[PDB]
Amino acid sequence: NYLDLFSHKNMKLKERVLIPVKQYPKFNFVGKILGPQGNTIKRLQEETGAKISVLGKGSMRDKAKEEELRKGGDPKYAHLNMDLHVFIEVFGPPCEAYALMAHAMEEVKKFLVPDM
Amino acid sequence: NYLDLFSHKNMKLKERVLIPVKQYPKFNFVGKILGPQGNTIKRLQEETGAKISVLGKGSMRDKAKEEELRKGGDPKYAHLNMDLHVFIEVFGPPCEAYALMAHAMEEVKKFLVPDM
Ligand SMILES: [Cl-]
Ligand SMILES: [Cl-]
Ligand SMILES: [Cl-]
Ligand SMILES: [Cl-]
């Protein structure tokens, strides 16, 4: 496909960014990213223009609930077998979509490489 | 696939950005982008870290040579039937690849939306 700088249709970008638990074994990535109340990831989404979701084994921080929901077989909880990760989905005008996503990646990198 | 911020393999991004000739009917996009001698696109590549190539109908600015080369059937000149466009190819570390590409898109947008 072509990227048309003058187009009205928005193009999507999606990345599933692993959460580097092995590199930061004691770091509560999930707590940090979500926030009290889910407020952080709310602000994070508001600020970046992007849809950001923590998904995968670990995301609920409740081995029990996760087992139960995975086992229940509901497809919304399907993500629970994936590696813990952050799912960034921008949907924006072609001229701005890489800027959006790079922004979003920058912001997310702030939590995922937190000492850097 | 997953984006792993700590990975050694570089991920590729590629976009074929149309050159907006209809929006700028008298603007010598090809001249501007390439430069005397191909020097501009050389500097442009050096600066952005990316592989940038002008391709498609128009790219050689020589309807003759283009006809001949297309007709010759050599597959290197295959691009000559495509819409005139700029082919941006970054190949960089996952943590930096969207930044690279966004950079490259910014720089290219400078020529392709030249009044903006
Ligand atoms: Cl440790
Ligand atoms: Cl965690
Ligand atoms: Cl005109
Ligand atoms: Cl032109």
From TrEMBL, chains A, B:
Q: Where in the cell is it found?
A: Cytoplasm; Membrane; Nucleus
Name the domain of life this protein comes from.
Eukaryota
Q: Where is the K Homology domain?
A: 11-109
Q: Which family does it belong to?
A: Belongs to the KHDRBS family.
**Name of the protein in its database record:** KH domain-containing, RNA-binding, signal transduction-associated protein 1
- Span of the entire protein shown here: 25 to 140 of 329
